[PDB]
Amino acid sequence: YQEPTDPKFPQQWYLSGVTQRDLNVKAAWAQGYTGHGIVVSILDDGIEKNHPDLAGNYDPGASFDVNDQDPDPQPRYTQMNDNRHGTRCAGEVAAVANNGVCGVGVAYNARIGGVRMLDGEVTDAVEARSLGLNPNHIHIYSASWGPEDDGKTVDGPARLAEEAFFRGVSQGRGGLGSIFVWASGNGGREHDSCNCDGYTNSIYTLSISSATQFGNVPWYSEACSSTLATTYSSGNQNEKQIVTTDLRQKCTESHTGTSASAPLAAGIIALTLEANKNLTWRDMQHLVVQTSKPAHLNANDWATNGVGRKVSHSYGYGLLDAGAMVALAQNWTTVAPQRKCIIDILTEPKDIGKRLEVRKTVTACLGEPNHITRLEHAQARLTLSYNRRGDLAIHLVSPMGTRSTLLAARPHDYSADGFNDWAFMTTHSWDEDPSGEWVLEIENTSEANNYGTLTKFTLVLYGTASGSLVP
Numbered sequence: 001y002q003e004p005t006d007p008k009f010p011q012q013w014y015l016s017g018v019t020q021r022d023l024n025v026k027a028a029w030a031q032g033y034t035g036h037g038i039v040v041s042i043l044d045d046g047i048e049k050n051h052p053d054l055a056g057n058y059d060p061g062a063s064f065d066v067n068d069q070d071p072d073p074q075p076r077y078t079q080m081n082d083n084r085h086g087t088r089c090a091g092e093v094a095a096v097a098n099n100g101v102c103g104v105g106v107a108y109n110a111r112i113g114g115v116r117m118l119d120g121e122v123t124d125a126v127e128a129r130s131l132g133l134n135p136n137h138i139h140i141y142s143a144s145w146g147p148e149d150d151g152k153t154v155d156g157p158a159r160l161a162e163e164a165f166f167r168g169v170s171q172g173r174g175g176l177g178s179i180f181v182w183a184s185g186n187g188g189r190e191h192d193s194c195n196c197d198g199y200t201n202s203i204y205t206l207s208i209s210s211a212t213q214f215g216n217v218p219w220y221s222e223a224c225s226s227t228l229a230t231t232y233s234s235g236n237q238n239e240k241q242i243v244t245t246d247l248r249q250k251c252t253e254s255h256t257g258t259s260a261s262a263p264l265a266a267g268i269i270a271l272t273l274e275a276n277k278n279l280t281w282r283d284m285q286h287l288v289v290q291t292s293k294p295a296h297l298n299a300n301d302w303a304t305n306g307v308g309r310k311v312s313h314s315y316g317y318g319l320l321d322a323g324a325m326v327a328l329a330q331n332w333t334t335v336a337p338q339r340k341c342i343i344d345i346l347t348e349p350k351d352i353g354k355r356l357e358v359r360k361t362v363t364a365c366l367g368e369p370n371h372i373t374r375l376e377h378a379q380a381r382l383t384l385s386y387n388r389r390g391d392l393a394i395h396l397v398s399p400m401g402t403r404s405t406l407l408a409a410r411p412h413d414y415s416a417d418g419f420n421d422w423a424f425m426t427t428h429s430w431d432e433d434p435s436g437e438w439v440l441e442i443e444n445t446s447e448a449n450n451y452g453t454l455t456k457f458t459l460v461l462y463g464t465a466s467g468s469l470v471p
């Protein structure tokens, strides 16, 4: 195997490193996996399809302009180069290799397109038409953005966009399911908590956070239990950043944020799908859980879950490992059909006050076709009123003892509107047996005499009843 000769490949430290602080992508390339035959689409502000490092891999069938309603996602050029982000992300996935231009994509033989959908009013219809673009041609969708990362918003896909997610994972990709890769958010300095973003909090998105070059939680990171895994991105000014294609046929060394991490994950997932084109959308999440690596990622919340995996709310299961992903993909056995066990918990509404604990022992649908002994995602779907939402912290403890933070205190969130059947999701109990006692904790983190009521708590378990590995 000959590594890429591109002039900036040495600067792509998160691919080219020899110090073990990388995504182990060279290992996958040397196994023969470069993304050939895989199609990725960047949902963003457009894609410069004539960029010298993108043209060779550009795919019009992976592209559309939902903002102006035409097939051509070319960016709108402006004096501040506002609409450059999709081009940056496209190159992360699939910049052409060995062509003397900039660097390379993770999946430098994949086909790459873009949906121009952020340069205009983003409505539910816009979102749905983007997520649902050509779902039997595009394999993987990469989305770096969502509701405002202001630390006070709770929002998610409205009806058309949620329908697009379920159509995508159900019928997309020939029934194997569209793979939606999402950035968990850039709201760190606003103390944002990413389960309040219903796109990344969805089970249908494979959500990705960031690590700095020195292995730290970047200033912009949002912690939450819905995150699955991590890729490198930017940090402080002594740490390197992401190197990729830029608007106006240029090359940037200063692509940043969690919004730069999701495309790298999309590229790794493209390599993995080349290694096994039969993987379902859930198979892909299983591979990420099993192969991702905590080592050398610094966080004060690493915890071992009930099946012996370390998990963090900043990093999920750790750094994606492309070589491990493609290796495990090749002989992966398709997971069983997804089961869903619905448990209505409360017998009566509960005053929250300063603190509320709800304990419930469940059988996880014992005796039923939705009996789950092997958890995937779990949700606590909560309906509650409270006078100042951001003073709440919410935790969910599984029978195996795994304490998932569903909501951290959000100091800017002054809302008195509470949560209306909000489906807080955790990945941290993946592969655990969910039978037994679950505990929901709701706490007022402020000294104020806050008040409200929990009126509904639905525990929703997803998973299967066969095929577990030894912890």
Ligand SMILES: CC(=O)NCC1CCN(Cc2cc(CN3CCN(c4ccncc4)CC3)cc(-c3cc(Cl)cc(Cl)c3)c2)CC1
Residues within 6 Å of the ligand: 043, 044, 118, 122, 123, 124, 127, 128, 130, 131, 142, 143, 144, 145, 146, 147, 148, 155, 156, 157, 158, 159, 161
């Ligand atoms: C009841 C009802 O109809 N509510 C409709 C709302 C519509 C709205 N969304 C939430 C939302 C909002 C927005 C819009 N923001 C996102 C950031 N951005 C920039 C970021 C950086 N520089 C320049 C621009 C544009 C401004 C972008 C998405 C979204 C994003 C992607 Cl990448 C993929 C997909 Cl699918 C979505 C999502 C919630 C539902």
Ligand SMILES: *[C@@H]1O[C@H](CO)[C@@H](O)[C@H](O)[C@H]1NC(C)=O
Residues within 6 Å of the ligand: 278, 334
């Ligand atoms: C894909 O997986 C399904 C489910 O196990 C199986 O029925 C089918 O034969 C597989 N197809 C290929 C081409 O491997």
Ligand SMILES: [Ca+2]
Residues within 6 Å of the ligand: 065, 068, 070, 071, 072, 073, 074
């Ligand atoms: Ca256009």
Ligand SMILES: [Ca+2]
Residues within 6 Å of the ligand: 006, 053, 095, 096, 097, 098, 099, 100, 101, 102, 103, 104
């Ligand atoms: Ca190149």
Ligand SMILES: [Ca+2]
Residues within 6 Å of the ligand: 147, 148, 149, 150, 184, 185, 186, 187, 192, 193, 194, 197, 222
């Ligand atoms: Ca956020």
Ligand SMILES: [Cl-]
Residues within 6 Å of the ligand: 340
């Ligand atoms: Cl469902």
Ligand code: NA
Residues within 6 Å of the ligand: 144, 145, 146, 147, 148, 149, 184, 185, 186, 187, 197
């Ligand atoms: Na965001």
Ligand code: NA
Residues within 6 Å of the ligand: 182, 199, 200, 201, 202, 203, 204, 205, 206, 207, 226
């Ligand atoms: Na997700």
Ligand code: NA
Residues within 6 Å of the ligand: 303, 304, 305, 306, 400, 401, 402
């Ligand atoms: Na534990």
Ligand code: NA
Residues within 6 Å of the ligand: 399, 433, 434, 435, 436, 437
């Ligand atoms: Na149990």
